[PDB]
């Protein structure tokens, strides 16, 4: 199949800004590249066909450029209803799509309010132990949360989960969950979480001992 | 009006098969349209599956298909089919049904969720997260998605972060929901999370309290 | 690659026919290049983008809403203006190496009939002059040029003969493929 | 109007009957290629053109736009259908006939409108299937069409041949006869 890749894998931009995403194809596809938009939960809405920014009415701020293999989607002045996943498309019967570009809100580099939680007694009855680590509200998403158990690092026993940009303050919250058995958890004493963020002078280490 | 409706999604064991349908309303296949099955992973990009010329019957499949999926149609029933055989957990995604991709004034479908797991429906296990200060609920080992989480029966809304679910090595899901409240009410105000799991009728109301 | 011209999008049985002909006119090689893109309902041309005019212009009333609608969209005008180069000029370069290089030599054949018919057959391109030891003109009838549709032409030239003294009658064919004219005696 | 060469880099056609369509390119009145909209393949009508590449998706996409444009123009013109034209059939041989030496029989079916027609060949009463080939619908300046069928024959002394045309304009099949 014709493979086509998008230039910014994801980007952070502000309202009013100019955004440029590119789509390069494996072959010449003439002037037949199309730009699709996708807000969460919905199927794609077509923005441009050929390079004609048309619909029964699509916002004139969107524009398509390029011919042959290299193409460019340009949103002149970003509006807030434009934070969406953008895709490039080719083919009516032999369909190819791009490795989408996420368009994310940019903001003041915030620091993560970090917290640790030991496993409950109710879960230790069950025979397992999950140690959580919250990194409430921060910017940008890029953050390293390492698990230290008795000062020795931990690799294949944690799992992170990141929320989307907040609807009020546009920040991300994270949750790395170290999971052990109620016997392996009982064999060690210090359990630490080492958050290392951009908006932090030094790596914060919130921690607990079993008693 | 003109719309396409997906049907047939669900949990299907690896190795087993699933047949989806795509009913068309508002138009007749008789007028020949190229209708396609485009699938989209959970949180990943749009990927093509197959297309069929509703006039002649001409089929095209994506390179990754290799005789595993089989598109077909019934013009009398105006329905599209996709027989997905030899399914792996890697094939778990949302299956869209779209008419004339890239041409203007052309519709897509809402989606149909196909989940490929050897997991069996299980109610979650709600545990508290020991408490500005933060408290929460660990909602461990359950299947299939999704889980409703409300704080203080809806009363608490600001500052709540219900984390996206994560698939554990056990094949079962596990999400957390945390909130930040002033450290003053840690004895005054009473906090309760409201987990719900319609797939296995498991409603829970855990009271989060300091130890 | 072969670049196509794109259609502009509008907002005893019965048949409804729509034709879109992206047409390129070339004169003095690529010196004078012209695109005229015709939108046609049944056999009536409704709209037209002429690269000389530079805009969509209705031919019939039925194509007036379309002409204004396509003229309001600035993307469509920029694209239709560029089609002269992207489509006509681009594709012409390929023609120079293939169709404009094609040449099939005419096979001249004099034979009597139910009066002599000089059959000039299987030749490409369409340029040809067939003539019948003085240039006989009044007693000669040529058929129009015959297009065979397989990228070859034919043309027949009949001459009413009133002969005497064993004088020779000669068919003289001139054609781009031929490095010297063909003469056939009778 | 006047040029040294004229080409149609897009002879896009879409009709309600079927429905059906035809994407072809033409250079100087001859058919360079057609895209089979079913098989999805550029079929070169000239060997020397096989070196180039035309993407079938380009043809398929224009035919989808054409379907749209047609539907709106059906409503806008208050459902006005096409007028059936009388096809002017003509039969002739590709080269002077010499008995025993192979030849091609050309049936030009001129002035076809709408472009929906049947063209078959007859030898001594019954139909011929082997050796028959035909060009796509070739566009005209007056927006009608024309097709050319071909029957590869070995000219015989007794044998007679006919071209059987079946357009909606004709009330009974036109049977043009071929005379050596
Ligand atoms: C336009 C036309 O001639 N249509 C005929 C159709 O009615 C007939 O069923 C078929 C078989 O001969 O050939 C075609």
Describe the structure.
- The complex is a heterotetramer of chains A (211), B (211), C (186) and D (180).
- Chain A is mainly β.
- Chain A has one helix at 121-126, and strands at residues 4-6, 10-13, 19-25, 33-38, 45-50, 62-67, 70-75, 85-90, 96-97, 101-105, 113-117, 128-138, 144-149, 152-154, 172-175, 178-181, 190-196, 204-209.
- In chain A, the strands form 4 sheets. In chain A, strands 2, 4, 5, 8, 9 and 10 form a 6-stranded mixed sheet that branches. A 4-stranded antiparallel sheet of chain A has the order 1-3-7-6, with no helix packed on it.
- A 6-stranded mixed sheet of chain B has the order 2-10-9-4-5-6, with no helix packed on it. In chain B, strands 11, 12, 14, 15 and 16 form a 5-stranded antiparallel sheet that branches. In chain B, strands 1-3-8-7 form a 4-stranded antiparallel sheet, with no helix packed on it.
- In chain B, strand 7 (69-74) and strand 8 (79-84) form a beta hairpin.
- Chain B is elongated.
- Chain C folds into 2 domains: 18-97, Roll (Class II Histocompatibility Antigen, M Beta Chain, Chain B, domain 1); 107-185, Immunoglobulin-like (Sandwich).
- The longest helix of chain C is centred in the middle third of the chain and has 24 residues, at 74-97.
- Chain C is elongated and about 75 Å long.
- Chain C starts with 16 loop residues before the first strand and ends with a strand.
- Chain D folds into 2 domains: 7-76, Class II Histocompatibility Antigen, M Beta Chain, Chain B, domain 1; 88-178, Sandwich (Immunoglobulin-like).
- The N and C termini of chain D lie far apart (38 Å).
- Chains in contact: A-B, A-C, A-D, B-D, C-D.
- Strand 1 of chain C pairs antiparallel with strand 1 (5-15) of chain D, so a sheet runs across the interface.
- The complex binds 2-acetamido-2-deoxy-beta-D-glucopyranose.
- Residues 116, 118, 166, 168 of chain D line the site of 2-acetamido-2-deoxy-beta-D-glucopyranose (NAG).
- Which class best fits the helix and strand makeup of chain A? mainly beta
Percent of residues in beta strands of chain A? over 45%
| Gap between N and C termini of chain A | 60 Å
Largest sheet of chain A: 6 strands, mixed
Q: CATH topology of the largest domain in chain A, which one?
A: Immunoglobulin-like
Number of domains of chain A: 2
- Tally of distinct domains of chain C: 2
**Biggest interface, and residues per chain?**
C-D, 69 and 71 residues
Tell me the name of the CATH class of the largest domain in chain A. Answer: Mainly Beta
Strand content of chain C: 35-45%
Q: Sketch the major β-sheet of chain C.
A: 5 strands, antiparallel
Family (chain C): Belongs to the MHC class II family.
Keywords (chain C): Adaptive immunity, Disulfide bond, Endosome, Glycoprotein, Immunity, Lysosome, Membrane, MHC II, Signal, Transmembrane, Transmembrane helix
Subcellular location (chain C): Endosome membrane; Lysosome membrane
Domain Ig-like (chain C): 106-183
């Amino acid at each position: 199949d014709i493979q086509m890749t998008q230039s910014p894998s994801s980007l952070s931009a502000s309202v009013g800004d100019r955004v440029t995403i590119t789509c390069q194809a494996t072959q010449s596809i003439s002037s037949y590249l199309n730009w699709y938009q996708q807000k969460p939960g919905q199927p794609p809405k077509l923005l441009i066909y050929y390079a004609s920014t048309l619909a029964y009415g699509i916002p004139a701020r969107f524009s398509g450029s390029g011919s042959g293999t290299d193409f460019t989607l340009t949103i002149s002045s970003l509006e807030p209803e434009d934070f969406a996943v953008y895709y490039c498309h080719y083919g009516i019967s032999v369909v190819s799509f791009g490795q989408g570009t996420k368009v994310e809100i940019k903001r003041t580099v915030a620091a993560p309010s970090v917290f640790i939680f030991p496993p409950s007694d109710e879960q230790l009855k069950s025979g397992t132990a999950s140690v959580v680590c919250l990194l409430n509200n921060f910017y940008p998403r890029e953050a390293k949360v390492q698990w230290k158990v008795d000062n020795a690092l931990q690799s294949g026993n944690s799992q992170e989960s990141v929320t989307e940009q907040d609807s009020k303050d546009s920040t991300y919250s994270l949750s790395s969950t170290l999971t052990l058995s109620k016997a392996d958890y009982e064999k060690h004493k210090v359990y630490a979480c080492e958050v290392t963020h951009q908006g932090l002078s030094s790596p914060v280490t919130k921690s607990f001992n079993r008693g | 009006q003109v719309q396409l409706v997906e049907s047939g999604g669900g949990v299907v064991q690896p190795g087993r098969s699933l047949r989806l349908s795509c009913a068309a309303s508002g138009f007749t296949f008789s007028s020949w349209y190229w209708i396609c099955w485009v699938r989209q992973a959970p949180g990943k990009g749009l990927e093509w599956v197959a297309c069929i010329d509703t006039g002649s019957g001409s089929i095209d499949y994506a390179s990754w298909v290799n005789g595993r999926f089989t598109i077909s149609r019934d013009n009398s029933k105006n329905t599209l089919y996709l027989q997905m055989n030899s399914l792996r957990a890697e094939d778990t995604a949302v299956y869209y049904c779209a008419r004339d991709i890239g041409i203007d004034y052309n519709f897509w479908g809402p989606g149909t969720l196909v989940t490929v797991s050897s997991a069996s429906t299980k109610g979650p296990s709600v545990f508290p997260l020991a408490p500005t200060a933060a408290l929460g609920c660990l909602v461990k080992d359950y299947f299939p998605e999704p889980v409703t989480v409300s704080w203080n029966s809806g009363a608490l809304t600001s500052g709540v972060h219900t984390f996206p679910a994560v698939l554990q090595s056990s094949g079962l899901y596990s999400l957390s929901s945390v909130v930040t409240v002033p450290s003053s009410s840690l004895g005054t105000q009473t906090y309760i999370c409201n987990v719900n799991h319609k797939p296995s009728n498991t409603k829970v109301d855990k009271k989060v309290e300091p130890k | 690659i072969i670049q196509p011209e794109q259609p502009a999008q509008l907002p005893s049985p019965e048949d409804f026919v729509y034709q879109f002909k992206g047409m390129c006119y070339f004169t003095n090689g690529t010196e004078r290049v012209r695109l005229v893109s015709r939108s046609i309902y049944n056999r009536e041309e409704i709209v037209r983008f002429d690269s000389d005019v530079g805009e969509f212009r209705a031919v019939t009333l039925l194509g007036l809403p379309a002409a204004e609608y396509w003229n309001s969209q600035k993307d469509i005008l920029e694209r239709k203006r560029a089609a002269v180069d992207r489509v006509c000029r681009h594709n012409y370069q390929l023609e120079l190496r293939t169709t404009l290089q094609r040449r099939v030599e005419p096979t001249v054949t004099i034979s009597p009939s139910r009066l002599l018919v000089c059959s000039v057959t299987d030749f490409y391109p369409a340029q040809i002059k067939v003539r019948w030891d003085q240039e006989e003109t009044a007693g000669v009838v040529s058929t129009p040029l015959i297009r065979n549709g397989d990228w070859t032409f034919q043309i027949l030239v009949m001459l009413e003969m009133t002969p005497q003294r064993g004088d020779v009658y000669t068919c003289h064919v001139e054609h781009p493929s031929l490095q010297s004219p063909i003469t056939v005696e009778w | 109007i006047v040029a040294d060469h004229v080409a149609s880099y897009g002879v896009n056609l879409y009709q309600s009957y079927g429905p059906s369509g035809q994407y072809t390119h033409e250079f100087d009145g001859d058919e360079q290629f057609y895209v089979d909209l079913g098989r999805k393949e550029t079929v070169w009508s000239l060997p020397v053109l096989r070196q180039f590449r035309f993407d079938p998706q380009f043809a398929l996409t224009n035919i989808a736009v054409l379907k749209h444009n047609l539907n709106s123009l059906i409503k806008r013109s208050n459902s006005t259908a096409a007028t059936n034209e009388v096809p002017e059939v003509t039969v002739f041989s590709k080269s002077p006939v010499t008995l025993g030496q192979p030849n091609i029989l050309i049936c030009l079916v001129d002035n076809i409108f709408p472009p929906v027609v049947n063209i078959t060949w007859l030898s001594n009463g019954h139909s011929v299937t082997e050796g028959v080939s035909e060009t796509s619908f070739l566009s005209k300046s007056d927006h009608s069409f024309f097709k050319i069928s071909y029957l590869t024959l070995l000219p015989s002394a007794e044998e007679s041949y006919d071209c059987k045309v079946e357009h909606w304009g004709l009330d009974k099949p036109l049977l043009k006869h071929w005379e050596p």
